[PDB]
């Protein structure tokens, strides 16, 4: 990159393939499962019904 | 089937197991004998 070039994902796609490697922003999101469990997020859809 | 299961020893006299109590310091072998006492004296389960 030298001093004057913005970094980019080097050689993601091979010239004969319509599908390359996963973009790094999708491969490595802001946090993993470990920090997700600490935040106590509420998954599993919703609570449910009374019957 | 009339010659199979219908011979005269109704085949559960010699394929039903018995329960001994040789293992009084074993604990899980004790628990399936105590249920076998409950399921032969009262011969239902005594749970309800």
């Amino acid at each position: 990159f030298g001093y004057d070039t913005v970094p980019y994902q080097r050689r993601r796609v091979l010239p004969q393939r319509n599908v390359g490697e996963t973009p790094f922003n999708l491969k490595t999101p802001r946090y993993n499962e470990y920090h997700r469990t600490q935040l106590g997020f509420p998954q599993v859809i919703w609570q449910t019904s009374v019957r | 089937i009339d010659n199979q299961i219908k011979q005269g020893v109704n085949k559960r006299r010699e394929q039903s197991k018995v329960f001994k109590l040789t293992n009084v310091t074993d604990k899980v072998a004790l628990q399936t004998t105590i249920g076998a006492i409950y399921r032969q004296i009262f011969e239902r389960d005594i749970d309800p």
Partner: protein, 161 residues
């Protein structure tokens, strides 16, 4: 008490002949599908208090039969009916791993019609609970085993009705 190994090996015994090629295709049918049965056997025992729970919620509960006057009002016997509905659940698995309804004749349907009319329990309400239990099982274990486990469920509904 018999088994699809044994009931084709004893019926060939009592005819005096040996392992016929028509008799050899029933054992290898049982040896092909036996891996499907043993993984289906563990999943019933892991859910055995929950197949009986969803059966009574879909067929039995919140009705006239648990209302005083019905037979289920005594909690002596609502303890006993979950015990009774457990009996058809475990013996269906014993009919499943044997591949044979012969245990159900000798250990479930020995005198079952007389003892239900001696107490006056409803026949079809129990048969409605077997029809509850056959669809709860086929969802929890997969339809390839529920289409075989339900055959011995219809063997119970034939003898009960």
């Amino acid at each position: 008490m018999q088994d699809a190994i044994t009931s084709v090996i004893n019926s060939s015994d009592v005819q005096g002949k040996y392992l016929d090629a028509s008799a050899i295709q029933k054992l290898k049918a049982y040896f092909a599908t036996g891996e499907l049965r043993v993984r289906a056997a563990t999943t019933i025992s892991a859910n055995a208090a929950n197949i009986v729970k969803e059966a009574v919620a879909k067929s039995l509960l919140y009705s006239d039969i648990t209302r005083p006057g019905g037979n289920m009002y005594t909690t002596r016997r609502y303890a006993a009916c979950i015990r009774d509905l457990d009996y058809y659940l475990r013996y269906a698995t014993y009919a499943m791993l044997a591949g044979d309804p012969s245990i159900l004749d000798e250990r479930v349907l020995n005198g079952l019609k007389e003892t239900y009319n001696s107490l006056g329990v409803p026949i079809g309400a129990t048969v409605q609970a077997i029809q509850a239990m056959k669809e709860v099982t086929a969802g929890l274990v997969g339809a390839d085993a529920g289409k075989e486990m339900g055959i011995y469920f219809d063997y119970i509904c034939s003898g009960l009705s």
